[PDB]
Amino acid sequence: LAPGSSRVELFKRQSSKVPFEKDGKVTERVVHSFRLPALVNVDGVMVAIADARYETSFANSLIDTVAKYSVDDGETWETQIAIKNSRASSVSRVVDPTVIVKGNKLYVLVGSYNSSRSYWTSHGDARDWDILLAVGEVTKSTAGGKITASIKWGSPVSLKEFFPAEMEGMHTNQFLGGAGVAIVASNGNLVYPVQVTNKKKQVFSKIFYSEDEGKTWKFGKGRSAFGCSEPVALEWEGKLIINTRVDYRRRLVYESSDMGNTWLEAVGTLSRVWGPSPKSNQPGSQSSFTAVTIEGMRVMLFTHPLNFKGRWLRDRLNLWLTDNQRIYNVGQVSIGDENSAYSSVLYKDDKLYCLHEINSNEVYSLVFARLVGELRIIKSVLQSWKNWDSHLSSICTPAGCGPAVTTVGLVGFLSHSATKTEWEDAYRCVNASTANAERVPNGLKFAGVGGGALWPVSQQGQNQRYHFANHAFTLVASVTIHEVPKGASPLLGASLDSSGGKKLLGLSYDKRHQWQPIYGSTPVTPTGSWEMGKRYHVVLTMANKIGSVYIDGEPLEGSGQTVVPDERTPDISHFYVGGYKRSGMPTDSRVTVNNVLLYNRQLNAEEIRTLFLSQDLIGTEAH
Ligand SMILES: CC(=O)N[C@H]1[C@H]([C@H](O)[C@H](O)CO)O[C@@](O[C@H]2[C@@H](O)[C@@H](CO)O[C@@H](O[C@H]3[C@H](O)[C@@H](O)[C@@H](O)O[C@@H]3CO)[C@@H]2O)(C(=O)O)C[C@@H]1O
Numbered sequence: 001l002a003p004g005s006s007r008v009e010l011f012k013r014q015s016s017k018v019p020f021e022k023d024g025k026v027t028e029r030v031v032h033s034f035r036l037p038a039l040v041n042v043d044g045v046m047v048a049i050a051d052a053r054y055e056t057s058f059a060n061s062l063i064d065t066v067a068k069y070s071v072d073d074g075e076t077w078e079t080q081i082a083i084k085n086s087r088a089s090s091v092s093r094v095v096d097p098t099v100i101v102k103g104n105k106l107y108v109l110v111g112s113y114n115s116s117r118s119y120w121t122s123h124g125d126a127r128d129w130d131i132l133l134a135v136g137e138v139t140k141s142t143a144g145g146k147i148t149a150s151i152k153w154g155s156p157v158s159l160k161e162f163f164p165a166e167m168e169g170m171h172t173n174q175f176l177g178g179a180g181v182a183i184v185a186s187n188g189n190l191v192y193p194v195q196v197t198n199k200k201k202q203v204f205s206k207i208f209y210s211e212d213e214g215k216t217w218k219f220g221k222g223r224s225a226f227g228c229s230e231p232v233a234l235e236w237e238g239k240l241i242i243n244t245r246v247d248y249r250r251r252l253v254y255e256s257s258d259m260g261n262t263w264l265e266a267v268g269t270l271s272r273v274w275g276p277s278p279k280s281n282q283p284g285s286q287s288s289f290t291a292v293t294i295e296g297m298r299v300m301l302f303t304h305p306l307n308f309k310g311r312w313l314r315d316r317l318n319l320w321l322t323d324n325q326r327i328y329n330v331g332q333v334s335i336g337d338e339n340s341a342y343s344s345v346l347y348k349d350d351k352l353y354c355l356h357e358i359n360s361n362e363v364y365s366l367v368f369a370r371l372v373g374e375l376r377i378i379k380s381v382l383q384s385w386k387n388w389d390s391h392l393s394s395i396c397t398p399a400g401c402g403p404a405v406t407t408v409g410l411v412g413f414l415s416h417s418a419t420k421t422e423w424e425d426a427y428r429c430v431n432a433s434t435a436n437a438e439r440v441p442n443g444l445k446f447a448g449v450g451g452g453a454l455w456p457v458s459q460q461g462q463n464q465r466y467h468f469a470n471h472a473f474t475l476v477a478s479v480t481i482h483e484v485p486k487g488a489s490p491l492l493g494a495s496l497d498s499s500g501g502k503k504l505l506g507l508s509y510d511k512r513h514q515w516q517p518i519y520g521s522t523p524v525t526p527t528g529s530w531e532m533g534k535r536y537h538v539v540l541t542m543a544n545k546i547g548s549v550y551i552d553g554e555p556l557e558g559s560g561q562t563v564v565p566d567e568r569t570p571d572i573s574h575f576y577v578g579g580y581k582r583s584g585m586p587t588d589s590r591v592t593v594n595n596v597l598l599y600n601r602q603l604n605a606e607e608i609r610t611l612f613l614s615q616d617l618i619g620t621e622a623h
Pocket residue numbers: 057058059095096119120121229230284285312341
């Protein structure tokens with residue numbers, strides 16, 4: 001928890017009681033575990049919805065949906081049962097509540113099971129299953145001098161009549177909400193991302209939405225890949241962004257502009273960025289994923305555990321901030337090495353909160369954290385993004401001012417700031433590591449075997465913010481060569497392996513004063529010419545499996561070659577700059593590199609020309 005932040009145990013395992021109703025009697029009953037947090041704001045009333053697992057944290061056991069609500073931002077709370085299960089057997093349960101706030105209403109979607117002790121995706125059919133929607137109406141009152149609220153929960157209604165028996169290529173089995181908090185779209189539709197099974201026991205995600213305040217429901221025609229569960233969605237620039245759990249794999253993220261009729265993997269931004277464990281080979285998790293406006297900027301907040309422990313332990317709940325370009329790790333929200341899987345982040349009245357799980361020995365509580373320090377960090381980072389974008393956008397570029405320098409898709413920028421071992425991203429998300437470097441205005445001067453800088457791509461590890469580069473990127477830099485090399489030496493490039501020896505796209509320079517652009521593993525043809533001590537502007541672009549190399553705004557002869565040779569998607573290890581930064585590679589690049597920009601798309605000709613013409617205006621030095 002960041003400085004100034006704090007928490008309390010709000011739903012306290014084996015301690016907190018809830019009003020358990022059975023056969024007309026209500027009794028305050030102790031709950032073993034509380035899971036499945038969903039924290040929302042209903043026009044001033046904070047509401048925390050969760051599972052109340054009465055007897056055990058085992059999934060297939062007696063569970064009702066509990067709600068705690070507060071009109072004083074979490075200082076005090078009232079408790080109720082929002083949805084009771086069928087009471088059919090000792091393991092009857094309403095499960096994985098998924099919440100949408102609209103007006104003064106809470107719409108809560110839960111699966112319902114009567115007697116199965118088996119995990120839901122193992123069921124061969126839906127004999128034990130129903131899908132229920134309950135609506136809580138929140139009413140406020142200023143009775144007695146102080147603010148009060150109450151929530152009246154309606155009886156649950158089954159939505160099973162809206163579930164078709166067939167979908168493309170399949171027979172349906174069951175579905176559940178994706179857990180946590182869903183949305184109202186800008187057109188008013190209630191939108192639940194749902195996880196669905198078929199009769200082959202495959203799981204996949206869909207959009208399940210209502211145009212009439214929840215009276216009827218429809219499925220979008222499209223779907224995610226099989227294997228995608230617990231989807232969580234937000235709306236961004238007219239599209240739904242659907243972020244999915246993939247057990248034992250990297251999280252897939254999709255975009256849909258048509259209420260789920262068509263799904264496109266978000267390969268250029270967020271898909272495959274987040275891994276469920278250090279080696280992305282462990283179970284995944286539910287994630288909070290919301291779009292909020294902080295100091296005038298629309299951004300997304302995302303949480304997921306790092307899960308160093310593995311299996312379902314899911315320690316180290318982390319918070320992430322992104323503007324759909326840059327992806328910043330705000331930090332760890334949970335404390336130390338506690339197990340802390342599911343979470344829900346709420347931004348209300350310019351204050352940030354998180355309701356999340358803590359698990360010791362499979363006994364779960366929900367803690368309620370005030371994210372004071374985290375909001376401070378977020379605001380600072382957003383200020384930096386806004387300030388650098390404004391700086392670049394406002395430069396009067398050379399002819400009357402010509403086209404503005406583009407900041408659309410600008411993800412990272414290495415310029416004047418550097419420490420002894422790192423070249424600092426102006427956007428504060430991903431620094432490059434360095435060796436044998438000396439600080440110069442707006443960049444670094446490198447020399448010697450092992451020299452250079454490494455801007456990690458897959459080397460970022462569990463969370464890969466630059467995964468987009470495997471699909472498209474532009475890498476831009478100003479360079480000056482100080483010594484004619486003995487053979488061919490590297491200057492800039494994207495490497496597929498850790499050494500730099502297997503390149504996707506790169507630029508080297510040689511002893512006959514020629515450039516050596518490298519297109520994948522294609523034979524290298526030297527071309528053009530450069531002069532020692534003269535500064536040049538370099539652009540590397542890749543999109544649609546084609547790589548190009550520009551020197552001083554102009555493509556080298558023969559550029560625009562295929563660099564992705566087959567069906568496999570590249571897995572770039574890193575960008576290398578000014579050398580390989582590998583003592584094991586015997587090359588000695590003696591060069592200065594300044595102002596390295598990374599974009600998540602292939603820049604157009606005008607944008608490249610503008611960067612070339614403005615290369616001496618973009619640096620961070622004076623600031
Ligand atoms: C309806 C439902 O079950 N929802 C829970 C989901 C799903 O089970 C999951 O997405 C698979 O469909 O996941 C959560 O529950 C898991 C949690 O209870 C852990 C606690 O250790 O156990 C997981 O089951 C494991 C079990 O631990 C293993 O020993 C072995 O039996 O495999 C099962 C695989 O299911 C539960 O899946 C979750 O926390 O991830 C929570 C939802 O309530």
